[PDB]
CSV table of C-alpha atoms and ligand atoms in Angstrom, one decimal:
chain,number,residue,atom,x,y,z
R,7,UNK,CA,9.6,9.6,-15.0
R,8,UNK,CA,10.5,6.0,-14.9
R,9,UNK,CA,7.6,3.5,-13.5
R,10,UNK,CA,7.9,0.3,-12.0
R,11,UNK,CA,5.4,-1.8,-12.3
R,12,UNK,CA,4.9,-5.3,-10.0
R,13,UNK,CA,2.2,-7.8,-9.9
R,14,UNK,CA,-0.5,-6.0,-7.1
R,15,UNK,CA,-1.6,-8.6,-5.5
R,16,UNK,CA,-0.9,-12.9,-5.7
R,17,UNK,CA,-2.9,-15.5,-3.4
R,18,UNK,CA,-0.6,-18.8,-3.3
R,19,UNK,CA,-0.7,-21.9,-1.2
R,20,UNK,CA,1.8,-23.1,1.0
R,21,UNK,CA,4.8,-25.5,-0.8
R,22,UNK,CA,3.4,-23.7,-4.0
R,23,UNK,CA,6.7,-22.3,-6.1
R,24,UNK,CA,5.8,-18.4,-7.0
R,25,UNK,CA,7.1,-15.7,-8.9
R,26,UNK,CA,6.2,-12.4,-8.6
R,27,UNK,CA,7.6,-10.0,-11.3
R,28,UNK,CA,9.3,-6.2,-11.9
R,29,UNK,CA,9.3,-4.1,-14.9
R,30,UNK,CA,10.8,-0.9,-15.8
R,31,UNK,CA,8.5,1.4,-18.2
R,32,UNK,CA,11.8,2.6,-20.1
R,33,UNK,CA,13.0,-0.5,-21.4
R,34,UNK,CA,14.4,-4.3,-20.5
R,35,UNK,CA,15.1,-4.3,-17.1
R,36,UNK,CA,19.5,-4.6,-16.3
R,37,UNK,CA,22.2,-5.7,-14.2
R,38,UNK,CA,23.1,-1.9,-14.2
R,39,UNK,CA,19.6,-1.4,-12.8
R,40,UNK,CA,20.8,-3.0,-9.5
R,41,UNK,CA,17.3,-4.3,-8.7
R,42,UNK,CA,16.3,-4.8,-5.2
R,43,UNK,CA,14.0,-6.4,-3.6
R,44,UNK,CA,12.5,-6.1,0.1
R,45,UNK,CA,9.8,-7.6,2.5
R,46,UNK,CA,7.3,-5.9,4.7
R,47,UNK,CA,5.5,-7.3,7.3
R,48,UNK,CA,3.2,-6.2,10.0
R,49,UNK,CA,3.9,-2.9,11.6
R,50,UNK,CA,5.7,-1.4,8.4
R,51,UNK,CA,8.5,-4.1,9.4
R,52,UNK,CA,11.2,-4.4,6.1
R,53,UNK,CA,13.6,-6.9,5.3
R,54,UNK,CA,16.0,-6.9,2.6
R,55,UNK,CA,15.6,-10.4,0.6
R,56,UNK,CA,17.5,-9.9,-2.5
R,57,UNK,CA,20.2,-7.1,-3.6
R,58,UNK,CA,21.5,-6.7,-7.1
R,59,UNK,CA,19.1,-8.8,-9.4
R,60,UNK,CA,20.7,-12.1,-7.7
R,61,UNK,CA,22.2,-11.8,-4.5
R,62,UNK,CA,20.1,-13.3,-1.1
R,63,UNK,CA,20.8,-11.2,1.8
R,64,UNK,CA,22.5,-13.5,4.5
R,65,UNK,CA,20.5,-15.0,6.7
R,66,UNK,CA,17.6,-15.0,4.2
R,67,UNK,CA,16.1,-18.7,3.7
R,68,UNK,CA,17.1,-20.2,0.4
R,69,UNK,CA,13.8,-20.5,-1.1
R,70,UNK,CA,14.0,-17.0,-2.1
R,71,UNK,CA,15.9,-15.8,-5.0
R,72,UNK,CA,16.1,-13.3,-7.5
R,73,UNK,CA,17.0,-13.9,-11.1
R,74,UNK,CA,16.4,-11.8,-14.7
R,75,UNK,CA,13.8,-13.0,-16.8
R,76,UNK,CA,13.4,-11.9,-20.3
R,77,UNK,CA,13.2,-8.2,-20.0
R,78,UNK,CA,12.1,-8.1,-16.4
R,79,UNK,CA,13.3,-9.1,-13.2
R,80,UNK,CA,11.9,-11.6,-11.1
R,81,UNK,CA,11.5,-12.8,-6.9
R,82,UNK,CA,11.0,-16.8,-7.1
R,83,UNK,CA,9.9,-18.3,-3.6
R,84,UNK,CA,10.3,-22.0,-3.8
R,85,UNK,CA,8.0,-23.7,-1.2
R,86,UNK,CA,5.7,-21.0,0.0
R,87,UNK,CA,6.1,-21.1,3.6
R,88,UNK,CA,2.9,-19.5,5.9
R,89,UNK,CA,5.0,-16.8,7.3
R,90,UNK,CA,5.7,-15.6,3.9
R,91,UNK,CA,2.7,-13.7,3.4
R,92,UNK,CA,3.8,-10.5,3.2
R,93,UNK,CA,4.2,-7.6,0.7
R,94,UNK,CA,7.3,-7.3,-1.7
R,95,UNK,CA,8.9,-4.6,-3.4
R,96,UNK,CA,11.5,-4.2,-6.1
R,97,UNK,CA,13.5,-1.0,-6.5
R,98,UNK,CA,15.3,-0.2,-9.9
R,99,UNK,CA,18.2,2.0,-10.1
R,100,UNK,CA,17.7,4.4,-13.0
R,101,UNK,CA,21.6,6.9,-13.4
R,102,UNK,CA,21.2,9.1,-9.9
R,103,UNK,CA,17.7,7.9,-8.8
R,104,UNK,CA,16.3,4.8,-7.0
R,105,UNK,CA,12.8,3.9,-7.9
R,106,UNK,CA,10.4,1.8,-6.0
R,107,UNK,CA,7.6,-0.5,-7.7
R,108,UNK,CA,4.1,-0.9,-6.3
R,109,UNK,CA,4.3,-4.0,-4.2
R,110,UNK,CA,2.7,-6.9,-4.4
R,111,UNK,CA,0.6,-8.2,-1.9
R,112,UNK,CA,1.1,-12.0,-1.8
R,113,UNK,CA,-1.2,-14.0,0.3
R,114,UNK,CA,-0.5,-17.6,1.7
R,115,UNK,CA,-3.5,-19.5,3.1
R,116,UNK,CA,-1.6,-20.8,5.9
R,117,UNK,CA,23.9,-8.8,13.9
R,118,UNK,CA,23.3,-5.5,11.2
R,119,UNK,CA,20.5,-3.5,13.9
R,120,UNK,CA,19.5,-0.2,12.5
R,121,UNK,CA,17.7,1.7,15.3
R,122,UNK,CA,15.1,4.2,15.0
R,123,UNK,CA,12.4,5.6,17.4
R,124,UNK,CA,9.1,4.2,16.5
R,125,UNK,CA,7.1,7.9,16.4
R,126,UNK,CA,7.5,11.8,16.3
R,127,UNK,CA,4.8,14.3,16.9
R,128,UNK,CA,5.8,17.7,15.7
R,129,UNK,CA,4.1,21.3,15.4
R,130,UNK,CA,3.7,22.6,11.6
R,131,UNK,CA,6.8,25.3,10.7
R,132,UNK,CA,8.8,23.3,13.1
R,133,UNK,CA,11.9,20.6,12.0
R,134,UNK,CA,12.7,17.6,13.0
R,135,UNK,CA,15.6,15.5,13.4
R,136,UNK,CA,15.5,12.0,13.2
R,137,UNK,CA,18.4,8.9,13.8
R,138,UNK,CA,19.2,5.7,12.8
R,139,UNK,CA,21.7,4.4,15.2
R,140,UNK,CA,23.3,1.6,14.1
R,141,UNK,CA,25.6,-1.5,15.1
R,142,UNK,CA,26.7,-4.7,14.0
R,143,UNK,CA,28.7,-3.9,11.3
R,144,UNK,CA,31.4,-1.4,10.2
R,145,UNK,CA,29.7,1.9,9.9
R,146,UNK,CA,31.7,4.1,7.8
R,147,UNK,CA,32.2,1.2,5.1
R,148,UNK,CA,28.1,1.4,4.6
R,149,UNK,CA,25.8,4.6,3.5
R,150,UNK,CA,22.7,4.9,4.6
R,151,UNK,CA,19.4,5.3,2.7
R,152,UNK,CA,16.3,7.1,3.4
R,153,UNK,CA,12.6,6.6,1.9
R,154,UNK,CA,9.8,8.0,2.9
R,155,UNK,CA,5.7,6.4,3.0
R,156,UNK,CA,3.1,8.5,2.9
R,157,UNK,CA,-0.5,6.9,3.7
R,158,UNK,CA,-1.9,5.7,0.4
R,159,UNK,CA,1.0,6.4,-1.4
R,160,UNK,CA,3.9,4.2,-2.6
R,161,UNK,CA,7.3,4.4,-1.2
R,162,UNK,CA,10.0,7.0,-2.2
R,163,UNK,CA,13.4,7.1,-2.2
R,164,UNK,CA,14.8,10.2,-0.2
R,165,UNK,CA,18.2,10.1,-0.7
R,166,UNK,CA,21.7,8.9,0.8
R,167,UNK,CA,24.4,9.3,2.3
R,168,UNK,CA,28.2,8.2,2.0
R,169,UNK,CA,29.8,8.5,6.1
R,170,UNK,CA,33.2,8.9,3.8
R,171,UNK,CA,32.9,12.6,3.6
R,172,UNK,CA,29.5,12.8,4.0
R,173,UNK,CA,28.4,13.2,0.6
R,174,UNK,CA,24.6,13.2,-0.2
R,175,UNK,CA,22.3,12.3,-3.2
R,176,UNK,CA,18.7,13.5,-2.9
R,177,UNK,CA,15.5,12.5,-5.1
R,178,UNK,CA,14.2,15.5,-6.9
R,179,UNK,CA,11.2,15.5,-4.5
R,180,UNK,CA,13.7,15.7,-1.4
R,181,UNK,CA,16.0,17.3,-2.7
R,182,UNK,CA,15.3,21.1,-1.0
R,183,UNK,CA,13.3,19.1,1.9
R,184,UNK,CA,15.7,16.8,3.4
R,185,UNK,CA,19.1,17.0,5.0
R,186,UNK,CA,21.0,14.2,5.7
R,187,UNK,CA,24.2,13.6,7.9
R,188,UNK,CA,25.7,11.2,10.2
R,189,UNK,CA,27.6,10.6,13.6
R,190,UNK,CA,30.6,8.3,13.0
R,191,UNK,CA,31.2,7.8,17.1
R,192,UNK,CA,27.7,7.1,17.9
R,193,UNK,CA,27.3,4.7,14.5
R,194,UNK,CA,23.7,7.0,14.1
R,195,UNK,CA,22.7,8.1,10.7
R,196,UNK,CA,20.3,11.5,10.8
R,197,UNK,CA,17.6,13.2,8.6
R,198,UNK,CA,16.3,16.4,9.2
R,199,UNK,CA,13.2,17.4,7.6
R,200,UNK,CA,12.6,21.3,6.9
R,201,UNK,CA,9.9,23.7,7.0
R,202,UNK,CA,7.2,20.5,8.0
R,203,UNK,CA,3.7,20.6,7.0
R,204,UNK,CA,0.9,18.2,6.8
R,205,UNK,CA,2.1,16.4,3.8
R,206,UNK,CA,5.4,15.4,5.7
R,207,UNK,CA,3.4,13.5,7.7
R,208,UNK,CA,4.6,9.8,6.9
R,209,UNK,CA,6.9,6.8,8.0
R,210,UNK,CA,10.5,7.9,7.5
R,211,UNK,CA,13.1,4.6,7.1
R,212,UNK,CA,16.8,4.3,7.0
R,213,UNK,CA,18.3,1.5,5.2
R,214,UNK,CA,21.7,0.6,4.7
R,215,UNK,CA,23.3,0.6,1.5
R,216,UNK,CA,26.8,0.4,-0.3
R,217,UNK,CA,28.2,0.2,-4.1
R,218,UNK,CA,26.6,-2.9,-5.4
R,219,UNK,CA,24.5,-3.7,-2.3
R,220,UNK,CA,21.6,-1.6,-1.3
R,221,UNK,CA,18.7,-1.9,1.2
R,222,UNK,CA,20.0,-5.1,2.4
R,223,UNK,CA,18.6,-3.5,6.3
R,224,UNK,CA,16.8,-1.8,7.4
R,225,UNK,CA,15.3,0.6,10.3
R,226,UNK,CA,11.9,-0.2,11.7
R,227,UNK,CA,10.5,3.1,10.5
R,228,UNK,CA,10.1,6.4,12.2
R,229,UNK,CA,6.3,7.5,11.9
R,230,UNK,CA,6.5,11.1,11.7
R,231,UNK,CA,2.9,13.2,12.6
R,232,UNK,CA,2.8,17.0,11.3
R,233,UNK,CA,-0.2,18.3,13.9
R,234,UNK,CA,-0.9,21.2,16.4
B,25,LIG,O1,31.6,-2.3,-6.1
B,25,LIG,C1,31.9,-1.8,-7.2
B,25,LIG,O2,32.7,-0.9,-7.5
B,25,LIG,C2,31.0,-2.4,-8.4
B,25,LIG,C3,29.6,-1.8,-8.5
B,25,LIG,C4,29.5,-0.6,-9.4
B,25,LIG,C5,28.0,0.0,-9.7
B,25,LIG,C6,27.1,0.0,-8.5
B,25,LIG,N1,26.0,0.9,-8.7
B,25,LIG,C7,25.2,1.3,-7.7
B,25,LIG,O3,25.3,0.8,-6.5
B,25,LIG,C8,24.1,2.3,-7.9
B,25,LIG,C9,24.5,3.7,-7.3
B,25,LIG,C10,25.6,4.4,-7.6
B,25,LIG,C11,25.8,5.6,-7.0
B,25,LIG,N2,27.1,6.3,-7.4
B,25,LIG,O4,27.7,5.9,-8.3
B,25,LIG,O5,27.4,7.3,-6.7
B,25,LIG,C12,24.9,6.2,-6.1
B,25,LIG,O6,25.2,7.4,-5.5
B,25,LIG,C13,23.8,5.5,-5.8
B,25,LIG,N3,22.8,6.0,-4.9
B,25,LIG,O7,22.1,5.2,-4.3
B,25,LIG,O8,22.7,7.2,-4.8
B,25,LIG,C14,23.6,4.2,-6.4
């Protein structure tokens, strides 16, 4: 029952130094909550910023970094740059569970490929099946994530899966929905969804992950239609 909570919305200037902010409900937020923090962009486009409070993914420009402050954690962008306007999450790590916060909405007045087909249409009652192939990188040494967005609604963490036996942890809303598995040869992670209805309707992203470094990358999002 653990909230996140983030800042909903920040209008900065470009060169202006922000921070935008994460808080868990339960308490000062940890190291051993292995926060996380991710960019989206126009059309439901993630990046992976920061992994594990501190860490800039590679590749990231310096001016972002993540740090604890006081009881909370913290995104600092030094030198607001026009094509950062964008909305940023946090995820907190609470024992088997990831949680995502809000987002904020910040508004500037200005190798790793994980593939995924951009849409599915499928029938009510029916399943689907969809993949994240992936190269660039060693494929069994990563797992794979899966979060789901439904329309309105804020982003939930699915599950994983380890391509070192296979082994799966589930969010307890996924956890009788979704099935996850992989293809070592073809470097494709998959989820089937059960039993679809209306409600499954939503856009459906892998992500990679590993002990220590999660959603560092990420698919460009499946957008999965339940309709007749
Ligand atoms: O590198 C080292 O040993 C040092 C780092 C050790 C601790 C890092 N913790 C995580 O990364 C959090 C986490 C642990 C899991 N677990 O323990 O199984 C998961 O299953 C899981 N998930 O997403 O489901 C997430």
């Amino acid at each position: 029952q653990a909230v996140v909570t983030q800042e909903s919305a920040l209008t900065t200037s470009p060169g202006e130094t922000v921070t935008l902010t994460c808080r868990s409900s339960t308490g000062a937020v940890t190291t051993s909550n292995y926060v996380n923090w991710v960019q989206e962009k126009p059309d439901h486009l993630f990046t992976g910023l920061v992994y594990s409070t501190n860490s800039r993914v590679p590749g990231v420009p310096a001016r972002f970094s993540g740090s604890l402050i006081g009881d909370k954690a913290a995104l600092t962008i030094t030198g607001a740059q026009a094509e950062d306007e964008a909305i940023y999450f946090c995820t907190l790590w609470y024992s088997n569970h990831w949680v995502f916060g809000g987002g904020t909405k910040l508004t500037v007045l200005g190798q790793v490929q994980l593939q995924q087909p951009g849409a599915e249409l499928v029938k009510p009652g029916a399943s689907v099946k969809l993949s994240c192939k992936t190269s660039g990188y060693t494929f069994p040494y990563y797992w794979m994530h899966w979060v789901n967005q439904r329309p309105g609604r804020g982003l939930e963490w699915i599950g994983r899966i380890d391509p070192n036996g296979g082994g799966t942890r589930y969010s307890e809303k996924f956890k009788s929905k979704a099935t996850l598995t992989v293809d070592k040869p073809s470097n494709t992670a998959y989820m089937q969804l059960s039993s679809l209805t209306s409600e499954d309707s939503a856009v459906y992203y892998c992500a990679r992950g590993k002990l220590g470094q999660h959603f560092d990358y990420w698919g460009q999002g499946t957008a999965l239609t339940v309709s007749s």
